[PDB]
Amino acid sequence: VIEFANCAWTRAIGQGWETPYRVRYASNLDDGPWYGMPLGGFGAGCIGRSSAGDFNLWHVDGGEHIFGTLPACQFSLFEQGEQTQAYALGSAPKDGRLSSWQWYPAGKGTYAVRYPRSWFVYEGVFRAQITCEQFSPILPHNYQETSYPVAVFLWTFSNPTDQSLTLSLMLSWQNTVGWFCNTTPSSAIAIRDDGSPVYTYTPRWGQSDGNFNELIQTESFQGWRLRRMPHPNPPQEGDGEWAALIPTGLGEFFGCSRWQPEGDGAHLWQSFSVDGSLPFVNDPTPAAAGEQVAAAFALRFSLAPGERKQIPVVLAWDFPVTEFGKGVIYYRRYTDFCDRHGTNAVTLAAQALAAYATWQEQIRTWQAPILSHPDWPDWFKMALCNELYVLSSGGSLWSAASDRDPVGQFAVLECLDYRWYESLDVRLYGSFALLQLWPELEKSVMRAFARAIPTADPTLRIIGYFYRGDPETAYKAPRKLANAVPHDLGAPNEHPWEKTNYTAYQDCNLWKDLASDFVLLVYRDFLFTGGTDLNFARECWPAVVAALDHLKQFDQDGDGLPENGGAPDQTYDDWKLQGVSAYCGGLWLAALEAAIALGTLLQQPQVEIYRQWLSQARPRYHQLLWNGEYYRLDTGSGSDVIMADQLCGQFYAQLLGLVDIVPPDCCDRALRKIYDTCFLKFHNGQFGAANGLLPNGQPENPHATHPLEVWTGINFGLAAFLWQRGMIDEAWRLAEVVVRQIYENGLQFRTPEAITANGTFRACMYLRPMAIWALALVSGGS
């Protein structure tokens, strides 16, 4: 019943890792390797469940992260034939809660994922063949269901034995209404040891006062709903409800609305483990001070020899408010298809029960071109889908529609350690999936950038690179200069979209890549959506002009080329560049080309000056940086290092149908050398491409950080570049190594920025790795 297991990530249920990757700095996040596929739409709030069956990831509070199991949130199975057996389908709690429950033995089945579908196939315990397919309706080109806070658990049971079986399927859940909010919002900003600003998150975990549960029973569906008394109007962050439903007509329904998840769970288990029933309870008493509450239902059915039954179970959660900074209130996009009152969980669940099979068909339909591609390896089909997981679990925001944002505004975090949105340098590579599958969301993000470019915040704030532990004497720079390009679209502790350039490790008002990134993204988004959206192009054009003028001020000598200087001033933000760099110089030339193309289409007056700049700048870049084998890092440092991502501009120019920014023979020779050195002489091509090595495969400096890291998303960009330049075998080999490192070593559903050669990672749950879609785009004909 797992469809195309070979294009799915699989692991035996509850099989762990001998030696997973671990975080390279102790102050940074490492929950360990037990992430499974997240459930829930983008910006819906999401929950994750591990390959052991534990619901351990709670992202119901928009942009916030909690990792921890609530053992009572779980499916349990009872079967009786020859023998009687009953198991909760998670791991045994370590702290002794639910001591009466028995837990499914590890290694007795397969967990499989191709996002947004996953499967538990249970085998070798029960006599029935039992599969649970878990999915949310994540649909490309669909700006409705993709936002929904629903998970479908589609169970298939079949009896392969000579004897009739009695089965019962239970879902219990703890009422967490009111838990998912910050009691310390707009808190003091601390500088962490890696230089990043951090805030304090103090959720109301375990605060259940007023929480109650009721059974739901109609002609069509039955289950439970988890609420809180009172429910204010309007709701505040944390206010809402859960529901879970099955259709009627499928067997005998046992409901128990109120049981104690902190106790031994015997009230439930003494019935369930014996005959698959529960004691009848419909008790909406609000929970007392100090008291936790949970609900459960079980469905009991018989399965005759050779019979197959399916049971759809749907969970829905209606938490409509995302509050960011204190008093900064947005509604979630799904509210446009119900309302903003936070009283809709049953109606959402009901819609799911009605539509789940349609949604399942639609998922098979959009994935079918990928799975049937004749020139894509199995691992790639798998990773292409699986890397979409971050669009759900990356602190994703998707707001309610407005006139100027007709499908809502959208944002994914750079990551959990680096808690701000849609970092521009990062999305250069990381935004290829969003462009291809949700181009209206892609456009809203770029429109948010466009609007922010002219704004300013003169307020002086600490720059982390320079911080020496005293706030008052610390070097500070203006939050944002008018017409500078912001690094990001703000943070979940402030105001996403509207308050930009939140990052403070460097002063991004000085960065030399961001302006080019902005232009290249605008043009790419216009071109790859048919070259017809003149509204998008006209809206972004003033910002294109402002961006390029901003970056042109950093051309000190007037040769046409902006020069790096000072603190690290581009995406490799622990790596100092001096003078014209290959990286930023390249992006600049590709940007100018892009602005010339778009500006000509739009008939704009700036086109003449961009052609003059490019006529000076383009020959000059080769003239300055060619060393005979590759492009020099920069003009000022005298470094002999090979930067793997030196010709990012040439990748982009060609991707965009624009003229080569360098001689294609030089491009090809540079790229061959990057591959032969940065990949093949970095521990023999075991990890992928290091960002910078000497021509002999040694580090320039054995202690440097960025040069000696493999950036997953940079590697995917490089693969795409290789493929576009005709080095096909090379692209597939490099991309394979990176996928294997992630999906074999405990990084699945938390893909990081960086791996080292020493079993360590940096910045789990990272935006860049969606760059695997750039390879799909260049190789995908069709």
* Exposed / middle / buried, residue 346 (Cβ in 10 Å: 0-12, 13-18, 19+): buried
The footprint of Ca ion on this chain (CB under 5 A) covers a number of residues equal to 2
Number of residue whose CB is nearest Ca ion: 323
Tokens matching residue 153:
């658990």
Give least dist CB 727 to Ca ion, A.
46
Place of tokens 């809402």: 240
Span interacting with Ca ion, options 129-137, 323-331, 440-448, 461-469, rule CB under 5 A: 323-331
Nearest to 725 by CA among 646, 644, 782, 670: 670
Residues 707/642, Cβ–Cβ less than 8 Å: no
Residue of 239, 323, 569, 753 that binds Ca ion (CB under 5 A): 323
Give DSSP secondary structure letters for 27-94.
TS----S----EES-TTS-EEEE-TTS-EEEEE-STT--EE---TTSEEEEEEESSSEEEEESSPPPT
Give least dist CB 439 to Ca ion, A.
28
In our burial notation (b when 16+ CB lie closer than 10 A, e otherwise), range 37-59 reads bbbbbbbbbbbbbbbbbbbbbbb
Span interacting with Ca ion, options 55-63, 160-168, 573-581, 705-713, rule CB under 5 A: 55-63
Pick the closer one to Ca ion by CB: 185 or 585. Answer: 185
In our burial notation (b when 16+ CB lie closer than 10 A, e otherwise), range 667-701 reads bbebbbbbbebbbbbbeebebbbbbbbbeebeeee
Pick the closer one to Ca ion by CB: 203 or 408. Answer: 203
Give least dist CB 235 to Ca ion, A.
13
Give least dist CB 340 to Ca ion, A.
16
In our burial notation (b when 16+ CB lie closer than 10 A, e otherwise), range 374-405 reads eebeebbbbbbbbbbbbbbbbbbbbbbeeeeb
Give least dist CB 178 to Ca ion, A.
13
Pick the closer one to Ca ion by CB: 199 or 212. Answer: 199
Pick the closer one to Ca ion by CB: 323 or 645. Answer: 323
Give least dist CB 730 to Ca ion, A.
45
Pick the closer one to Ca ion by CB: 494 or 513. Answer: 494
Span interacting with Ca ion, options 59-67, 72-80, 282-290, 476-484, rule CB under 5 A: 59-67
262 to 301: interface string for Ca ion, x by CB under 5 A: ----------------------------------------
CA distance 379 to 528: 26
When asked if residue 54 is in the footprint of Ca ion (CB under 5 A), the reply is no
Give least dist CB 316 to Ca ion, A.
20
- The footprint of Ca ion on residues 152-181 (CB under 5 A) is none
Pick the closer one to Ca ion by CB: 61 or 387. Answer: 61
Give least dist CB 64 to Ca ion, A.
6
Residues 172/296, Cβ–Cβ less than 8 Å: yes
CA distance 176 to 58: 11
Give least dist CB 501 to Ca ion, A.
20
Span interacting with Ca ion, options 29-37, 57-65, 636-644, 700-708, rule CB under 5 A: 57-65
Pick the closer one to Ca ion by CB: 323 or 753. Answer: 323
Q: Bridge partners of 314?
A: 152, 245
CA distance 208 to 127: 39
CA distance 722 to 123: 43
Pick the closer one to Ca ion by CB: 8 or 328. Answer: 328
Q: How far from 771 is each of 67, 279, 714, CA to CA, in Å?
A: 26, 52, 8
Span interacting with Ca ion, options 56-64, 118-126, 420-428, 695-703, rule CB under 5 A: 56-64
Span interacting with Ca ion, options 220-228, 320-328, 592-600, 609-617, rule CB under 5 A: 320-328
Pick the closer one to Ca ion by CB: 61 or 239. Answer: 61
- Pairing, β 197-198 against β 190-191: antiparallel
Pick the closer one to Ca ion by CB: 61 or 145. Answer: 61
Extended strands (E) in 600-655: 642-643
The site for Ca ion (CB under 5 A) is made up of: 61, 323
